[PDB]
Amino acid sequence: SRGSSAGFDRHITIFSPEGRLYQVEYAFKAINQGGLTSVAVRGKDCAVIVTQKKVPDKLLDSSTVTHLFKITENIGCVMTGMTADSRSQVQRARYEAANWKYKYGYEIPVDMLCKRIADISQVYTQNAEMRPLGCCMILIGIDEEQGPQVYKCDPAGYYCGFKATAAGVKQTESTSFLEKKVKKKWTFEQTVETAITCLSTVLSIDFKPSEIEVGVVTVENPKFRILTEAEIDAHLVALAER
Amino acid sequence: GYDLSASTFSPDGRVFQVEYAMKAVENSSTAIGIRCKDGVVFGVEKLVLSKLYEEGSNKRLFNVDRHVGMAVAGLLADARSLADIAREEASNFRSNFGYNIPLKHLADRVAMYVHAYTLYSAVRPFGCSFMLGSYSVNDGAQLYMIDPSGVSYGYWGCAIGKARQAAKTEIEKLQMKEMTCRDIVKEVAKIIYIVHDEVKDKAFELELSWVGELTNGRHEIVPKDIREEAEKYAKESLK
Amino acid sequence: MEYLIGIQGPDYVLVASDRVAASNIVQMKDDHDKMFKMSEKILLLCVGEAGDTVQFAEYIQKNVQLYKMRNGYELSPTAAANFTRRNLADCLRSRTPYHVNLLLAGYDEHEGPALYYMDYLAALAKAPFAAHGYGAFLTLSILDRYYTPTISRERAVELLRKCLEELQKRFILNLPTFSVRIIDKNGIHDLDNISF
Amino acid sequence: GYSFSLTTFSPSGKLVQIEYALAAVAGGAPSVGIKAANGVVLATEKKQKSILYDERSVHKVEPITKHIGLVYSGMGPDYRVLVHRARKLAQQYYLVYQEPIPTAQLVQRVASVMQEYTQSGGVRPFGVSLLICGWNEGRPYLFQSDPSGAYFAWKATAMGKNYVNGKTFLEKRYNEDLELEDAIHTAILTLKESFEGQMTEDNIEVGICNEAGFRRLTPTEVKDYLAAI
Amino acid sequence: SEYDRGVNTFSPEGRLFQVEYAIEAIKLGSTAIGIQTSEGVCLAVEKRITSPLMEPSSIEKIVEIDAHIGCAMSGLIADAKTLIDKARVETQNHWFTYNETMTVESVTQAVSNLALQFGEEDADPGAMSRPFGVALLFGGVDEKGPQLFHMDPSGTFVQCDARAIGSASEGAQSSLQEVYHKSMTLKEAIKSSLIILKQVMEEKLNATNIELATVQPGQNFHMFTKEELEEVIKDI
Amino acid sequence: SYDRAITVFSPDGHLFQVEYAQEAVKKGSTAVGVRGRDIVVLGVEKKSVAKLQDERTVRKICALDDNVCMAFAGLTADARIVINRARVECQSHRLTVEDPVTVEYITRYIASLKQRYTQSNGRRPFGISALIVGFDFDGTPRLYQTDPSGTYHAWKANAIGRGAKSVREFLEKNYTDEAIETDDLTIKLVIKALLEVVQSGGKNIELAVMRRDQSLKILNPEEIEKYVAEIEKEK
Amino acid sequence: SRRYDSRTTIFSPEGRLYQVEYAMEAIGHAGTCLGILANDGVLLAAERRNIHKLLDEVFFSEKIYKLNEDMACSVAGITSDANVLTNELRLIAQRYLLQYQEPIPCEQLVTALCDIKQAYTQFGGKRPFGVSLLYIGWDKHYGFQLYQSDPSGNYGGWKATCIGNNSAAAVSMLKQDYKEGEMTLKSALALAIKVLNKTMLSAEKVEIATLTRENGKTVIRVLKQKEVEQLIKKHEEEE
Amino acid sequence: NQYDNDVTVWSPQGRIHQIEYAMEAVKQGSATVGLKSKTHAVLVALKRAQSELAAHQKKILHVDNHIGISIAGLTADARLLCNFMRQECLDSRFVFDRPLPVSRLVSLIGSKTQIPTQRYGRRPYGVGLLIAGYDDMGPHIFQTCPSANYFDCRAMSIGARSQSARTYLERHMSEFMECNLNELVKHGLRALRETLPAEQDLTTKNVSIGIVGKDLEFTIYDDDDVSPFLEGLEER
């Protein structure tokens, strides 16, 4: 013990002598491999997700480079980590949500969708012939009784609800920032500005409107919405003047 | 060793088998695509390994649907297998929904097929990046690229293969947003001739195709005459 | 139509069957045997639709012989009869039902003589005597009239003769000869054919 | 799918994958079970580093039927797998017999599933031990099911981090005459024995099973019991 | 341990390891001889008796495939059983369907299509796990006349005028080159093949430790009896 | 289902799994067969008496049919599987041909079963060799042997298992027309051959006989001790 | 995948099956379990490993399983595997009762389970079951009977035996003290206690089950602690 | 080393060693030559005989009236691929009633042979083909490699010492289009003869020729039939 290893415990999802799954830990490192950070914050009215949009290549069609995806009309998601893995998991989430609606006649609750995705990742953590997916999914939606929800699942198959969270390279620093902030208010009331300020602080950037994307759901407007450039800029300017 | 199976992460969270497939792509000769006002134009530097081959052997440009062209780089048998997959996906889409598959959906479906071969010890990643190009009145011009990892993005201009960086650097000099296919074919030929490494490989053929409003949205080979005038322009620019 | 009869005494079981194999209007064979030796002390008498009868009886026979070879001892009459019923019932609702009617006669060291009746539906009943075929309609009442539980084998053979003579007199089908066998502690004994 | 077993016998006769799963369980969060005269209590601590966690969003103590519930120590996602399997087994039983599944039958079926995952091809054992409580035939039941698929009926026990000391604490402190309220009390004291970092109604979960059935306690009931402690 | 690779692995020389090893396994087999003449083909094989308690007649290394085709075997004799059975069944299927005798070449091709049907994620629940450690000489007569075919574990088959297989195949093949000629008679071929077997056998050749068969346009596959073997050995 | 290729060739044409199966057979208890004129005898060493053993339950001479029986050496559970397969095939044969099996037919069947299990994915070879004895319908006595490779041959006499080498040597020197002229002498040959290697001697020998049409009769210890005394005073 | 497979079903260079031998090693460490046949019955006595103070005592036995009306068994080794095998035994016995309408003779049940274990040792690439069993039973052919089977799929009938911890010494002591043909149930029980006393003493630490015949019916009972304490007292008086 | 045993393992250089080894399998086959004119496509093949007494293995196989193949590499894989091609041609004629165009058949070969290159425990086909065909665009020569990468060729040579034949073909390739059939076959034989060791020559026994064209169904030329083409080749 203390970093011990036997047999193939670094190659497939079998237990190490300490009872760890090294392949899952490496999937967590893969999440940071893509080099991006995402932030999500919930308030009484709103659930907001903001992430970096990095387009170094002027030849990318920037309207197709997004980590925000609509799952259903009322559920949005931001993906962090390996992009193709993210796309596959988004497709799986979309299928599970549609099938849920078909079988049960009401929209899937965000917690149940997150749980389902976490169980699928668990399957990949227990069968040796395939790897876990290297992507940490964050979901937002409005639940009819509890209001806005933010849930995250990971390659280990864990899933927990959060007041706010982050993923990717600066996950820990964002988490510290949001803890410190939430201690000043048990949630927020002006949420998009908090999210953007958190991301700007932990990245030390001070963003232009083309470097982030923002999506929101509200009790008044439960439909998942991606902000236009003008709306993001109006938030950035309102923040800049404080 | 952590690099024998696509089901094995490295300690740094890498999937080395995918990177090695990308290296297989990066050893291949260069293909470029450029989207412009009224369509998309493809060109490929097609190395002739023997003068015994017919001019036209080992096409690297494929039609995957009447409105969708495909340009490939990397291990050619794998690319052709993916072109057959794309064709099947387009046919099934038309059969089920009754209209031409939107380029973005085709790109996403084929990218997910490529991705499915990156999870398992039972199969290896594809060794072939490929481009998809399309045009319609409703959607305009669209150009997508897929690599062995299964990532899919849309591009104004793109290059794949061993001289990718030099090609992108040349493409960046074009104001492609304002030019037509008739203008762009010359420039595609020019960049291919510029980025071609004539010292290490002595002879290549230029293959050119386009799809846009000038073809009424059908993907077609470039007419022979336009190909020779584009080549002549490229050669004199090479001066 | 085919005829089977069995008569169970204190320490023996007597069975008989006609020796005719017929087709449409002809006796293709007049010395046909419908009894299959299952083991040293068990006879299965199989009748019914052509084809089904031999295939079923030989299947049962081979699996019983397999049991003997595998285990070093014989099936009891009761176990063999229940095995037969299980097989027939399992094939009853399949794509390949067997339209066979059977008697199973045996002697067990510990349980003594046993005679079992089974119909094509695979209903199994133990009986002191039984008969199959249209001839059963003409002979069962004779058995009811004259049988007793302590009937000696010589009397049982007389009773059997009276039944078969009744078939010769009154039954519309030509069953001129019958195979007769008895099972006891000493195994299966062939008796003389009864002929008219 | 790989068709070969990933757990095999070592030269000393150990199934090392099972031993390592048990090592994973020993490193899991503590759980406690106490069988009282008239019921059973199950309790476990939530660590939660981040205040950011929504403690009500996921539960470790979960009902299986009206009368049976479970908790675990070890890897959460495997636990969710086993919960779903146990619920399905319990429903299959109810569909056949039209009687709630006896606790011991549910334990036997879950243990048999775990054994299958200790022998079938290309899978590892579950890195979870379950504590299952129930009430039927007017009597309480508490079971543990190991990663190997072995199960044991306990009067009281602890699992997860510091379980050895938890077991000795209960051996010194448990008696059969203990009442449900008292058993809850002693479960809370036993977790506090190996807690570290101030107990709150938000970082533990407690469930009870009696004649009325199995249910999780709400945060206010736990707050109430912590006032007494 | 030592084996850590698939049954379908190519060597750097472009050969399948398993097939090369099966060919090496053929060298452990007992010697068989074929000669093709205008009057027919003869087959002769070394019995390789390991104990006088063994019945030599229960070693059968030459078998009838059909009335017009025989087969001599060398190598792992137990492996050859499924090949011989496939050949017999194929010939009877061909007779059934076409009402004619199957050619020797067609039989050999049909058997050789069973070769290389190995690998471990491909086929029906219990297909072949490894190549056959067997070489075969098919000798028969059809409308093409007398014909002798050889097949090895690679699945390559070819007509040969004369061939030795088994432990002494080098050596014996050289002698076949020396003595063979196109106008050789069947009786001369029998003599030559027994002379060669006599040379290459470790044990002293006698009428019990060999088998010999012929096929001629005239008559069906015929295994020589003890007395006929003694008779032919008398001259040598 | 598990389809891994387990038995493969190694350099120089070896099948290591088959050689190892033969090594497993060589560690089995010795079994002997001799074909007599109108009798065939099987004997096997009981190396592990166990005063507490129920002898009946571990006999190594099992009947395959009325006219065929067999002994084995090697892994007994594998042997049990092979035996029950052969018993099934013998009953199938009776079903379809309405004749008993020849000894050769069932030997060939068992050998081909073993060969298929040396060439099929997912399975290891059988770790047994068998001596199969009996009579063909025409009364001819027969003795065949199978080994894990699937090879089979007929023998006048043979031994398998531990010390098979020296027992074969003994039979080679002693199997003559004179030594099998009568039932008593063939049997005393088998017993002498076992006593060449059996540790305790006489006390721990299983012996079984088959006569023309008579079905396998096993000899009880009293009878074996009787032959043993009859042989020892002669020596 | 060939790299990760352990090849549980191959021969070793000496003709051994290593997984079987290792399962046997596992059994050698499990609780002592012995079986004795007498003229008027059969008994099982097993070391309890469930001896911790907090166990609750909820089932009718720990290691003794009823298989059918006429048979019971005990196990040594991996408990979960034993649960699997005893369930399979119960299914086999009931299938036989269904088919034949008589209780399965003991040896046929033992043989069927040993054939399942053997299949697990020969193909399928799974680990063998790490269990040895003692079976006690009555049937009409051979009356009282005692069997042992192990992970090789071997079995034998025994007058007396032992599996599990210190098995060798126990079997030696039975070999030396057992009186073939002359044991009663009272004396078999006394010997069983003698053997466990030397090879391990308290009633709570042992479990004993007897199988006898009364009025044409098989009766299977686990002795209550009162009776076991009495037998232990009588052994200590006798010493 | 660790990267050369599995067809599913990319090397760090972006290569698949099993494919390279299969191409070595093709390179070690006996040389064969294919070429075409404006009106005819011709195949010429050297047959190897293991010894002087072997008949020489067939290298050229009828596929359909408009298509035949010469072979290099594993004979059994060659037969398997030929049988696939035969079935595909028959199916195409059954369904559409016209001969399958050669380039579409070659595409089908590429697709079939690519599949095992991507799945664990499978192997590439260890055979290279030259395919001669005639369709609406005239004669064609295609080459199929074990990589499944196929090539449309004006002419090509594969197998042992085939570099010499390729050099000859390049040297004389400006002539092929206008050659009559006799001249074209002579050219094929000269190219193939370049592959032979200095002492050996082309004979009627070791050369096989296949020709198809506008007015000529795919036809096989063997020993007595090759004499006309061989009467007219120089010594050097």
Short mmCIF file of C-alpha atoms in Angstrom, two decimals, chain E residues 59-226:
data_model
loop_
_atom_site.label_atom_id
_atom_site.label_comp_id
_atom_site.label_asym_id
_atom_site.label_seq_id
_atom_site.Cartn_x
_atom_site.Cartn_y
_atom_site.Cartn_z
CA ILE E 59 -2.64 -48.70 -37.83
CA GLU E 60 -4.39 -47.34 -40.91
CA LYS E 61 -2.44 -44.55 -42.60
CA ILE E 62 -3.89 -45.20 -46.06
CA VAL E 63 -7.66 -44.90 -46.37
CA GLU E 64 -10.25 -45.11 -49.10
CA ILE E 65 -11.88 -41.78 -49.88
CA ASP E 66 -14.03 -43.28 -52.62
CA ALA E 67 -13.76 -46.16 -55.06
CA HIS E 68 -11.59 -44.11 -57.44
CA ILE E 69 -9.56 -42.12 -54.87
CA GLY E 70 -7.24 -43.18 -52.07
CA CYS E 71 -5.37 -41.11 -49.51
CA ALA E 72 -2.04 -41.54 -47.75
CA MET E 73 -1.29 -39.54 -44.62
CA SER E 74 1.70 -38.48 -42.58
CA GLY E 75 1.99 -36.41 -39.44
CA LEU E 76 -0.46 -36.18 -36.57
CA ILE E 77 -2.69 -39.07 -37.56
CA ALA E 78 -5.56 -38.14 -35.23
CA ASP E 79 -5.87 -34.71 -36.88
CA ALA E 80 -6.28 -36.37 -40.30
CA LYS E 81 -9.59 -37.99 -39.33
CA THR E 82 -11.75 -34.91 -39.87
CA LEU E 83 -10.02 -34.29 -43.20
CA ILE E 84 -10.62 -37.83 -44.43
CA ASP E 85 -14.24 -37.67 -43.28
CA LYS E 86 -14.73 -34.33 -45.04
CA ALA E 87 -13.27 -35.80 -48.23
CA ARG E 88 -15.54 -38.86 -48.06
CA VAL E 89 -18.64 -36.74 -47.42
CA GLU E 90 -17.74 -34.25 -50.16
CA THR E 91 -17.31 -37.07 -52.69
CA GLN E 92 -20.64 -38.61 -51.76
CA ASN E 93 -22.37 -35.22 -51.91
CA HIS E 94 -20.87 -34.70 -55.35
CA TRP E 95 -22.07 -38.11 -56.53
CA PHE E 96 -25.53 -37.39 -55.09
CA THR E 97 -25.91 -33.99 -56.74
CA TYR E 98 -24.20 -34.53 -60.09
CA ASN E 99 -24.46 -38.32 -60.65
CA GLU E 100 -20.78 -38.53 -61.57
CA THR E 101 -17.49 -39.29 -59.88
CA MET E 102 -15.64 -36.33 -58.41
CA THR E 103 -12.22 -35.56 -59.85
CA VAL E 104 -9.13 -36.00 -57.71
CA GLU E 105 -8.29 -32.31 -58.11
CA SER E 106 -11.75 -31.25 -56.96
CA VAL E 107 -11.53 -33.48 -53.88
CA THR E 108 -8.11 -32.10 -53.00
CA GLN E 109 -9.35 -28.52 -53.41
CA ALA E 110 -12.42 -29.29 -51.28
CA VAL E 111 -10.26 -30.67 -48.48
CA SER E 112 -7.73 -27.84 -48.72
CA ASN E 113 -10.51 -25.30 -48.24
CA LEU E 114 -10.66 -26.56 -44.65
CA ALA E 115 -7.10 -25.40 -44.11
CA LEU E 116 -6.41 -22.00 -42.54
CA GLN E 117 -9.93 -22.01 -41.05
CA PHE E 118 -8.58 -21.14 -37.63
CA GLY E 119 -8.63 -18.16 -35.30
CA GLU E 120 -10.32 -17.42 -32.07
CA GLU E 121 -13.04 -14.81 -32.70
CA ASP E 122 -14.61 -15.47 -36.05
CA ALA E 123 -16.53 -18.68 -36.55
CA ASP E 124 -19.25 -20.96 -35.23
CA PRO E 125 -19.12 -22.09 -31.56
CA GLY E 126 -16.53 -24.82 -32.06
CA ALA E 127 -14.50 -24.25 -35.23
CA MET E 128 -10.88 -25.31 -35.66
CA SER E 129 -8.49 -23.75 -33.13
CA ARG E 130 -5.25 -24.55 -34.98
CA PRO E 131 -4.06 -25.83 -38.35
CA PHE E 132 -3.91 -29.53 -39.14
CA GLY E 133 -0.62 -31.24 -38.44
CA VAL E 134 -1.16 -33.43 -41.49
CA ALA E 135 0.06 -33.81 -45.03
CA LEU E 136 -1.96 -35.80 -47.54
CA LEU E 137 -1.34 -37.61 -50.80
CA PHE E 138 -4.51 -38.03 -52.86
CA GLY E 139 -4.16 -40.66 -55.57
CA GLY E 140 -6.89 -41.59 -57.99
CA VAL E 141 -8.19 -41.90 -61.53
CA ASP E 142 -10.71 -39.70 -63.32
CA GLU E 143 -11.32 -38.58 -66.90
CA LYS E 144 -7.99 -36.74 -66.71
CA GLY E 145 -6.35 -40.12 -66.09
CA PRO E 146 -4.16 -41.02 -63.11
CA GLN E 147 -3.42 -38.11 -60.80
CA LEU E 148 -1.52 -37.63 -57.54
CA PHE E 149 -2.04 -34.56 -55.37
CA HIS E 150 -0.19 -33.34 -52.29
CA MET E 151 -1.60 -31.01 -49.64
CA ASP E 152 0.10 -29.45 -46.63
CA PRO E 153 -1.09 -27.44 -43.57
CA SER E 154 -0.83 -24.20 -45.55
CA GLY E 155 -3.72 -25.35 -47.73
CA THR E 156 -1.51 -25.28 -50.80
CA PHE E 157 -2.13 -28.23 -53.08
CA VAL E 158 -0.41 -29.20 -56.31
CA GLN E 159 -0.24 -32.15 -58.66
CA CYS E 160 2.98 -34.11 -58.39
CA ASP E 161 4.49 -36.89 -60.45
CA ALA E 162 6.22 -38.17 -57.31
CA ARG E 163 6.45 -37.00 -53.69
CA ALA E 164 7.69 -38.15 -50.32
CA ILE E 165 6.35 -36.78 -47.04
CA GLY E 166 7.35 -37.36 -43.46
CA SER E 167 10.59 -37.70 -41.58
CA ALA E 168 12.69 -38.90 -44.54
CA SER E 169 11.10 -36.75 -47.25
CA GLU E 170 14.46 -35.21 -48.03
CA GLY E 171 16.59 -38.04 -49.24
CA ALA E 172 13.60 -39.94 -50.55
CA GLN E 173 12.62 -37.04 -52.81
CA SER E 174 16.17 -37.03 -54.22
CA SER E 175 15.91 -40.74 -54.94
CA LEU E 176 12.53 -40.20 -56.60
CA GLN E 177 14.18 -37.63 -58.88
CA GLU E 178 16.84 -40.23 -59.66
CA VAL E 179 14.54 -43.14 -60.53
CA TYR E 180 11.37 -41.49 -61.85
CA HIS E 181 10.58 -41.35 -65.55
CA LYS E 182 7.35 -40.58 -67.40
CA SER E 183 7.15 -43.99 -69.11
CA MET E 184 7.62 -45.97 -65.88
CA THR E 185 5.22 -48.88 -65.51
CA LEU E 186 3.04 -49.39 -62.45
CA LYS E 187 4.97 -52.52 -61.45
CA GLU E 188 8.24 -50.59 -61.77
CA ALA E 189 6.77 -47.78 -59.68
CA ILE E 190 5.75 -50.24 -56.96
CA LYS E 191 9.26 -51.70 -56.95
CA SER E 192 10.90 -48.26 -56.85
CA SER E 193 8.67 -47.07 -54.00
CA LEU E 194 9.33 -50.18 -51.92
CA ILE E 195 13.08 -49.89 -52.59
CA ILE E 196 12.95 -46.29 -51.38
CA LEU E 197 10.91 -47.15 -48.29
CA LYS E 198 13.40 -49.94 -47.56
CA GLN E 199 16.19 -47.37 -47.76
CA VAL E 200 14.57 -44.76 -45.53
CA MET E 201 12.92 -46.93 -42.84
CA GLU E 202 14.80 -47.26 -39.57
CA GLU E 203 13.25 -50.70 -39.05
CA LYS E 204 13.86 -53.59 -41.43
CA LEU E 205 11.07 -53.57 -44.02
CA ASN E 206 8.79 -56.60 -44.07
CA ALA E 207 5.26 -57.43 -45.20
CA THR E 208 3.77 -56.33 -41.86
CA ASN E 209 5.29 -52.87 -41.28
CA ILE E 210 4.19 -51.38 -44.61
CA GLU E 211 0.97 -50.79 -46.49
CA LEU E 212 0.62 -50.42 -50.22
CA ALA E 213 -2.29 -49.45 -52.43
CA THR E 214 -2.84 -48.77 -56.11
CA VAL E 215 -5.52 -47.19 -58.24
CA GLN E 216 -5.78 -47.95 -61.95
CA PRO E 217 -8.16 -47.00 -64.76
CA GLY E 218 -9.22 -50.65 -64.79
CA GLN E 219 -10.13 -51.31 -61.19
CA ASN E 220 -11.11 -49.68 -57.92
CA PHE E 221 -8.83 -48.62 -55.07
CA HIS E 222 -7.10 -51.81 -53.90
CA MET E 223 -5.17 -52.31 -50.67
CA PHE E 224 -2.49 -54.98 -51.08
CA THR E 225 -2.99 -58.02 -48.87
CA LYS E 226 -0.23 -59.62 -46.80
#
